[PDB]
């Protein structure tokens, strides 16, 4: 069980790195999401500013 | 470096640092790492067979891993990090041991070729200098007055006519 144990320890270290990287992956995505979820608020203001123009 | 791989693949077959060290510094490295990491280590040693020694540390954790290396590299310990395999570096290292042993067998053959013409000639080159320095040490004892040396010294009266 010596080299069976080392490999579990080794796996333990990858699982830890993956856990850390997963949180970093979250932020990366959240940076693209911030642009996505900001694009929907903007174009709804754009067609309202045209509406009150079509009135004038 | 071959032996600290052979004696640390065997330890796994029966956060860790593997390297070489002189044997007279193993106990002081054990004590300094035990006083740095309060406990928190599993320190082994296996004699490489100047005499040297291997060591395994198992630095259980982080934030001192670059500080254990400042203990090892201070008292002239050479860490051997592998990180790939204990069977792939051994081939690339035995491909250098014999490749450099052949350069030993070339240059030492050239050395023993050169020493043949010298070992039978040193009693001439040495005995030239031993008397040439003895000539100039005696020529320092003369006068050098008027572009000619004056040698004043003693000789027995029986050997006066032999000098003359």
């Amino acid at each position: 069980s010596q080299k069976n144990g080392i490999a579990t320890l080794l796996q333990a270290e990858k699982e830890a790195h993956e856990i850390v990287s997963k949180a970093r992956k979250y932020r990366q995505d959240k940076l693209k999401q911030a642009k996505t979820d900001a694009a929907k608020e903007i174009d709804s203001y754009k067609i309202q500013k045209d509406k009150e123009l079509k009135e004038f | 470096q071959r032996q600290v791989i052979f004696e640390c693949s065997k330890f796994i077959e029966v956060y860790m640092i593997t390297g070489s060290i002189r044997r007279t510094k193993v106990d002081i490295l054990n004590r300094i790492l035990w006083r740095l990491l309060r406990g928190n280590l599993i320190f082994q040693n296996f004699p490489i067979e100047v005499e040297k020694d291997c060591f395994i540390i198992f630095t259980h954790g982080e934030t001192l891993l670059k500080k254990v290396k400042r203990v090892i590299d201070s008292l002239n310990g050479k860490i051997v990090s592998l990180n790939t395999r204990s069977s792939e570096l051994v081939d690339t290292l035995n491909r250098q041991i014999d490749d450099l042993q052949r350069i030993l067998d070339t240059t030492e053959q050239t050395l023993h070729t050169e020493l043949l013409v010298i070992h039978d000639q040193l009693p001439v080159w040495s005995a030239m200098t031993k008397r040439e320095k003895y000539v100039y040490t005696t020529l320092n004892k003369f006068q050098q007055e008027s572009q000619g040396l004056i040698a004043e010294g003693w000789v027995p009266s029986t050997e006066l006519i032999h000098l003359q």
Partner: protein, 159 residues
């Protein structure tokens, strides 16, 4: 070399001394005072190589390394190519080809010992193997130069 030895062991008459000193100056002055880059390029191109006073100096190489670069030390690479060529073509231990090898090998040690990047060049061209054969190839100056050529390479690969 003969003149330099003479200078220590001078002859009583003054005029003799003057001749020893004046001759000594021209021979020595003349070789060193020519540009380092010129001398190296001139020998490699014509394919005729011989040791000379500034051609064996450490300084000669030190100045000339940077200059070589044009396509990853293209000139140095041509030299390794010349050492390689000579051994394979026309055999070895023929008077001409044997002179060049000792010189080519002296030049390559100094350059290699100087710059660690040279190690890639031996490997790419395939000069590193050629040197291992040269230890085995006859004559004392040849195996001597090959051993020096090998020790400079080794030092940077594995310390």
């Amino acid at each position: 070399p003969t003149v330099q030895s003479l200078s220590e062991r001078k002859y009583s008459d003054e005029e003799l001394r003057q001749d020893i000193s004046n001759l000594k100056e021209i021979l020595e002055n003349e070789y060193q005072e020519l540009t380092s880059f010129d001398e190296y390029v001139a020998e490699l191109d014509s394919k005729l190589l011989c040791w000379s006073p500034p051609h064996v100096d450490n300084g000669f190489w030190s100045d000339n390394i940077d200059e070589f670069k044009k396509d990853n030390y293209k000139i140095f690479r041509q030299l390794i190519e010349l050492l390689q060529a000579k051994v394979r073509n026309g055999d070895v231990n023929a008077k001409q080809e044997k002179i060049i090898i000792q010189v080519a090998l002296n030049d390559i040690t100094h350059v290699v010992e100087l710059l660690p990047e040279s190690i890639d060049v031996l490997d790419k061209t395939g000069g590193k193997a050629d040197i291992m054969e040269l230890l085995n190839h006859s004559d004392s100056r040849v195996k001597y130069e090959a051993l020096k050529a090998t020790q400079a390479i080794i030092g940077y690969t594995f310390k």
